[PDB]
Amino acid sequence: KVYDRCELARALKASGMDGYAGNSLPNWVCLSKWESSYNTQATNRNTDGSTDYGIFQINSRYWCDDGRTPGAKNVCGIRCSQLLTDDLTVAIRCAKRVVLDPNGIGAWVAWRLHCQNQDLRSYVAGCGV
Ligand SMILES: CC(=O)N[C@H]1[C@H](Oc2ccc3c(C)cc(=O)oc3c2)O[C@H](CO)[C@@H](O[C@@H]2O[C@H](CO)[C@@H](O)[C@H](O)[C@H]2NC(C)=O)[C@@H]1O
Numbered sequence: 173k174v175y176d177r178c179e180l181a182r183a184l185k186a187s188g189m190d191g192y193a194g195n196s197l198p199n200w201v202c203l204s205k206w207e208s209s210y211n212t213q214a215t216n217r218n219t220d221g222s223t224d225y226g227i228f229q230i231n232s233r234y235w236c237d238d239g240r241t242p243g244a245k246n247v248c249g250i251r252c253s254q255l256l257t258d259d260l261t262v263a264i265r266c267a268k269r270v271v272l273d274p275n276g277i278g279a280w281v282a283w284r285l286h287c288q289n290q291d292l293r294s295y296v297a298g299c300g301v
Contacts, residue, residue, distance in 0.1 A: 173211075173212045173213075173258035174209070174210055174211045174212075175204075175210040175211075175212070175227070176210070177201065177205070177210065177295070177299070178296075178298060178299035178300075178301075180201060180204060180210055180227075181197060181201050181295075181296050181299040181301050182299065182301055183260055184197060184200050184201065184264070185197055185301045187260065187261075187264045189264065189267075189268075190301075192268055192271065193268075193271045193272060193276060193277075194276075195271060195276070195277050196292075197296055197301070198292035198293065198295045198296050199277055199283065199287060199292060200267075201292075201295040201296060202283065202286065202287035202290070202292050202295045203228065203277070203280050203282055203283040203287055204227050204228060205295065206282035206283075206285070206286040206287065207224075207227070207228060207229040207280060207282040207283075208226065208227050208228070208229055210227060211227065212226050212227045212255075212256055212257060212258055212260070212263070213226075213256050214226060214227070214229060215256070216229060218231070220233065220242075221240070221241055221242050222241045222244070223238055223240075223241065223252065225238070225252045225255040225256060226255035226256055226263050227260065227263055228255075228263055228266075228267045228270075228280070229280070229282070230248070230252075230255055230263070230266055230267070230270065232244060232252050233245070234246075234247055235247050235248045235250075235266055235269070235270060236248055236250050236251065236252035236254070236255060236266065237250065237251050237252060238251070238252040238253075247269065248265070248266035248269050248270075250262060250266060
């Protein structure tokens with residue numbers, strides 16, 4: 173599913189992401205936009221054999237099992253396929269686990285590049301949340 177921006181904001185807000193580990197909602201909408209363009213089915217193959225999955229583009233070397241990633245750990249304890257569903261429940265749960273590590277939201281390259289230190293008001297503008 174390709175989420176609408178406000179539709180995504182409402183689902184994140186409803187799932188307790190606004191302030192999760194000190195990361196306000198606009199942070200999460202901005203990273204989703206630059207990481208996958210709000211598409212839950214996005215996938216990206218990396219040069220190291222790992223693949224990024226879903227709306228948050230979670231990497232298979234560390235967080236999920238895709239069965240073809242060498243030296244993988246699967247910390248979220250899931251199949252990467254579960255990160256591609258229209259339903260965000262597993263993705264949100266795994267994203268919550270990722271931000272608890274030492275690097276926080278800095279784990280996402282798109283956040284570091286396009287969201288970090290920026291004015292993120294426009295990402296939730298007009299959503300009513
Ligand atoms: C959201 C997701 O899956 N993010 C993970 C991620 O994913 C990517 C995915 C795509 C790219 C692309 C296209 C380019 C580029 O330059 O870097 C990337 C990192 O890779 C890093 C790189 O190692 C993982 O960070 C590493 O993850 C674990 C988990 O906390 C730590 O133990 C390490 O310390 C930490 N490595 C470093 C050096 O930051 C982080 O989790």
